[PDB]
């Protein structure tokens, strides 16, 4: 018995990451084993760690956590440094509009676990972690139970399936901080401290958990690892475009007829995601904007872009928030400002003061209580959150709002 979870709609054209997770229920170890589960792990333990890294490298798998860093290459960088090494599964999620990771965790936990074991074996990590946001309590209990099932079937512990490979997966819980999804703040939280990001370089692969070589990978990235080993890297590379291969999860929300998670190839366009898969807009209203989480804003003129990691592509985590013709862009921008105001860790002065001021002055603009100075101050603040920032939060806190100012000038002008 687990806490109540809303039944998020899930649809796939690939039947890979959502083979089981397309059904809104927990799939236990017996059901997973019936689908050939843990057989990729068996195949991996009969391979050298170096060969697994090579297959993952050749698969073209890129990080699904937002930055798109090549996974095989991240592993290579870690293994060039002496042990002990640590493997971390990043399950913090928490970016507005993003709900792709929880559906693997809550419905197909063994797909993630198998991926963690293979990945840990590949980098020589005998200690692995899942750091899950505190607001996913059901996901936490589901993972703890699934780990016990895996232990009981001999997939975890000492000398796994007689390979000589040892592994324990620990499940840690977050407690409200969005910044704990930034890999160094996550590491600080695992060490029992406040989620304060550390300057990079050094990257975690050089100095991470306890200052030791550490690989941090997103839930969705790890869920691909059993497929690469099961199919081989070549057959995996056949899925979607050869430059941006494999399955990808698209959390679609807002003004769509069918909101939910869609498993599609990355050559799908944003237009196809909304109209071909998510069933078009509510009330058949015109698309005004697409918010790529709290990161980017795309206008109705930019719907034909591919959902890949290319320069002109959608990028990010493939998070699609649809806004229609009657949605106030300034009101929408205020919610994005309020998000960054609430989540800055405050270590960096322009990020600390900038996230606060951007939201405070934007509230004044929206309520019609802003002076000429508040207007000019807001514009300046938005362009100056980034200077001296340690991490990606300060670098992007003004990004989406600046794009709304540039793509919707007429609407912002109404508020003057």
């Amino acid at each position: 018995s687990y806490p109540a979870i809303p039944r998020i709609y899930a649809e796939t054209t690939l039947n890979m990451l959502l083979k089981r997770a397309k059904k809104p229920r927990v799939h236990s170890i017996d059901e997973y084993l019936k689908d050939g589960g843990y057989q990729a792990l068996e195949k991996a333990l009969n391979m050298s760690p170096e060969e697994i890294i090579d297959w993952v490298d050749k698969s073209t798998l890129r990080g699904r956590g937002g930055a798109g860093f090549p996974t095989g290459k991240k592993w290579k960088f870690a293994v060039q440094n002496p042990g002990p090494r640590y493997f971390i599964c990043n399950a913090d999620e928490s970016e507005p509009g993003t709900f792709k990771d929880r559906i693997i965790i809550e419905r197909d936990p063994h797909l993630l676990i198998e991926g963690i074991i293979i990945s840990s074996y590949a980098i020589g990590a005998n200690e692995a972690y899942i750091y899950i946001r505190g607001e996913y309590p059901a996901g936490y209990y589901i993972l703890r139970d699934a780990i016990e099932e895996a232990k009981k079937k001999g997939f975890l512990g000492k000398n796994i399936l007689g390979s000589g490979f040892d592994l324990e997966i620990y499940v840690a819980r977050g407690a409200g901080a969005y910044i704990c999804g930034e890999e160094t703040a996550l590491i600080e939280s695992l060490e029992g401290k406040r989620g304060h990001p550390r300057l990079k370089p050094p990257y975690p692969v050089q100095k991470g958990l306890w200052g030791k070589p550490t690989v941090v990978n997103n839930v969705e990235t790890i869920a691909n690892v059993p497929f690469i080993i099961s199919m081989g890297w070549e057959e995996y590379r056949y899925i979607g475009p050869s430059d941006y291969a494999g399955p990808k999860l698209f959390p679609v929300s807002g003004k769509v007829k069918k909101p939910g998670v869609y498993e599609l190839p990355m050559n799908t366009t944003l237009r196809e995601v909304i109209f071909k898969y998510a069933g078009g807009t509510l009330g058949n209203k015109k698309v005004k904007a697409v918010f790529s989480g709290a990161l980017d804003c795309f206008s109705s003129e930019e719907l034909d872009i591919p959902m890949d990691y290319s320069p002109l592509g959608f990028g990010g985590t493939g998070t699609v928030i649809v806004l229609t013709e009657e949605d106030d862009i300034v009101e929408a921008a205020l919610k994005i400002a309020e998000f960054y105001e609430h989540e800055t860790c405050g270590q960096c002065t322009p990020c600390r003061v900038g996230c606060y001021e951007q939201a405070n002055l934007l509230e004044k603009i929206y309520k019609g209580e802003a002076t000429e100075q508040d207007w000019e101050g807001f514009d300046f603040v938005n362009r100056n959150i980034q200077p001296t920032s340690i991490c990606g939060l300060g670098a992007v806190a003004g990004r989406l709002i600046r794009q709304t100012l540039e793509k919707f000038p007429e609407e912002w002008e109404k508020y003057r």
């Binding site: 109540a4 809303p6 507005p96 505190g134 977050g174 407690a175 807002g254 928030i321 949605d327 919610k335």
Partner: protein, 155 residues
Amino acid sequence: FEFPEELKTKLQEHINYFPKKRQAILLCLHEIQNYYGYIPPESLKPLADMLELPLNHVEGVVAFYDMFDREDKAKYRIRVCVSIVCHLMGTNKLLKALENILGIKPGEVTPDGKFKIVPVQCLGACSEAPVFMVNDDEYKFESEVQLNEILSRYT
């Protein structure tokens, strides 16, 4: 101050879970809040000793992680998402319905100390917007009649 044996056993279990004692800080704090309905300021000192951490470290950790409440004791925390998707889909309708049923606004506690409305950032169930949690349980708000029936399950 002393923790009851049923809670102390759970805290020691979390402390023995990770390779290092200090890594259990957040699991211990979640356990304290689930048992008391908040973080009693008196609990920090015996928790610090069990974790073999200074009190200042523990205090800083409690203040940083905003799921922890040191101010108000509440049996059930109604976490209401106030982020972009839920706002666009009806956060205000959910808040209005909560005020009609319980007579309280965000940040407030019912006179019986039963419910507290906690405004929160994106809960990651955006396709099911407007989203709310009642302690560990999570739901899509549909209407006041539907909400009234959900809340009646929390006694």
